[PDB]
Amino acid sequence: CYIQNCPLG
């Protein structure tokens, strides 16, 4: 993930 890019699924 990343601050403004976290795969939530």
Q: DSSP of 1-9, one letter per residue?
A: --TT-----
Q: How far apart are CA 7 and CA 5, in angstroms?
A: 6
Q: How far apart are CA 3 and CA 7, in angstroms?
A: 11
Q: How far apart are CA 2 and CA 8, in angstroms?
A: 11
Beta carbons within 8 Å of 1's beta carbon, 6+ residues apart: 7
